[PDB]
Write an enzyme that holds these catalytic residues in place. Structure first.
Site, PDB file in Angstrom:
ATOM      1  N   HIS A  42       0.828  -1.270  -0.152  1.00 42.89           N
ATOM      2  CA  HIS A  42      -0.094  -0.060   0.056  1.00 42.89           C
ATOM      3  C   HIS A  42       0.720   1.160   0.131  1.00 42.89           C
ATOM      4  O   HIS A  42       0.339   2.336  -0.080  1.00 42.89           O
ATOM      5  CB  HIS A  42      -0.825   0.048   1.280  1.00 42.89           C
ATOM      6  CG  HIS A  42      -0.503   0.203   2.586  1.00 42.89           C
ATOM      7  ND1 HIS A  42      -0.056  -0.855   3.525  1.00 42.89           N
ATOM      8  CD2 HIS A  42      -0.039   1.136   3.106  1.00 42.89           C
ATOM      9  CE1 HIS A  42       0.454  -0.618   4.548  1.00 42.89           C
ATOM     10  NE2 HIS A  42       0.474   0.672   4.395  1.00 42.89           N
ATOM     11  N   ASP A  87       0.808  -8.025   2.031  1.00 39.27           N
ATOM     12  CA  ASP A  87       1.237  -6.564   2.187  1.00 39.27           C
ATOM     13  C   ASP A  87       2.569  -6.482   2.048  1.00 39.27           C
ATOM     14  O   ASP A  87       3.346  -6.151   2.810  1.00 39.27           O
ATOM     15  CB  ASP A  87       0.528  -6.092   3.436  1.00 39.27           C
ATOM     16  CG  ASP A  87       0.534  -4.592   3.203  1.00 39.27           C
ATOM     17  OD1 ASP A  87       0.878  -4.006   1.837  1.00 39.27           O
ATOM     18  OD2 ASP A  87       0.514  -3.760   4.242  1.00 39.27           O
ATOM     19  N   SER A 179       4.932   2.490   8.500  1.00 39.81           N
ATOM     20  CA  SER A 179       4.443   1.425   7.366  1.00 39.81           C
ATOM     21  C   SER A 179       5.654   0.975   6.317  1.00 39.81           C
ATOM     22  O   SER A 179       6.102   1.975   5.918  1.00 39.81           O
ATOM     23  CB  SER A 179       3.166   1.905   6.526  1.00 39.81           C
ATOM     24  OG  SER A 179       2.033   1.569   7.274  1.00 39.81           O
TER      25      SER A 179
END
Ligand SMILES: *[C@H]1O[C@H](CO)[C@@H](O[C@@H]2O[C@H](CO)[C@@H](O)[C@H](O)[C@H]2NC(C)=O)[C@H](O)[C@H]1NC(C)=O
Ligand SMILES: [Zn+2]
Ligand SMILES: [Zn+2]
Ligand SMILES: [Zn+2]
EC number: 3.4.21.-
Length: 227
Positions: A42, A87, A179
């Site tokens: 992402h 992810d 992240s």
């Protein structure tokens, strides 16, 4: 990183930061090969820069610093919204890194983390939640891997073996801005910061990280297919 401490210098030479002009850091990344980074899917962006061997958040010049351009972004094919499984994503640098005490790749473990394993997660994300507050330099925090059972209980119907939970101690957790960052256990790269509850560091709500032990073959095959 909520309630962490300034990392020791030179202890995270594989830590990377992704920037998109001027110097807005939007995700962390991890150097896993002389020419490849690993980050969360992402965190994909068309135009951006890669900064390695740099301790502080601001673009203050540092000797160990090394800037790059991402020539290719390859997210795992299984990545999907809103589940967020698989992810992870590979990013190819325009050129290979000049190995130094500041910039150095890290190996990805093939052995999955078991409940109790102490791991270290780092990043330049906010140190407060929900109130935003960025640190001056790279933040470090040790978190422990929970059992897949507790993990699934904490987040019913939104967890599979492509992820793992970590962070038992309350007031301590990763957060927005971390992240794509690394989670190191036993000197190996075990995971990437993926997601968690909001606000961050809520009691009994552990962070959720990408379970890299499930992707070694894909990572290596993808790197070789693009060498
Ligand atoms: C999380 O735990 C690790 C391991 O317990 C901490 O690393 C220790 O750091 C101290 C101070 O530098 C050393 O004296 C120890 O030798 C280290 N542990 C060992 C035996 O490898 C790490 O600092 C902790 N992370 C944070 C920042 O809380
Ligand atoms: Zn240095
Ligand atoms: Zn999403
Ligand atoms: Zn401040």
């Amino acid at each position: 990183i909520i309630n962490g401490s300034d990392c020791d210098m030179h202890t995270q030479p594989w830590q990377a930061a992704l920037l998109l002009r001027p110097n807005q850091l939007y995700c962390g990344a991890v150097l896993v090969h002389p020419q490849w980074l690993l980050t969360a899917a992402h965190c994909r962006k068309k135009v951006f820069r890669v900064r390695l061997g740099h301790y502080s958040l601001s673009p203050v010049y540092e000797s160990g610093q090394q800037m790059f351009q991402g020539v290719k972004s390859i997210p795992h094919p299984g990545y999907s919204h809103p589940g967020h499984s698989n992810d992870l994503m590979l990013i190819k640098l325009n050129r290979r890194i000049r190995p130094t005490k500041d910039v150095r790749p890290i190996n990805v473990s093939s052995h999955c983390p078991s409940a109790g394993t102490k791991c270290l997660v780092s990043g330049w994300g906010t140190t407060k939640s929900p109130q935003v507050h960025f640190p001056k330099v790279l933040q470090c925090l040790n978190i422990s891997v929970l059992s897949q059972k507790r993990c699934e209980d904490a987040y019913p119907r939104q967890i599979d073996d492509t992820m793992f939970c970590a962070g038992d101690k309350a007031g301590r957790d990763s957060c927005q801005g971390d992240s794509g960052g690394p989670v190191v256990c036993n000197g190996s790269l075990q995971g990437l910061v993926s997601w968690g509850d909001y606000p961050c560091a809520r009691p009994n709500r552990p962070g959720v990280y990408t379970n890299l032990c499930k992707f070694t073959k894909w990572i290596q095959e993808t790197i070789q297919a693009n060498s």
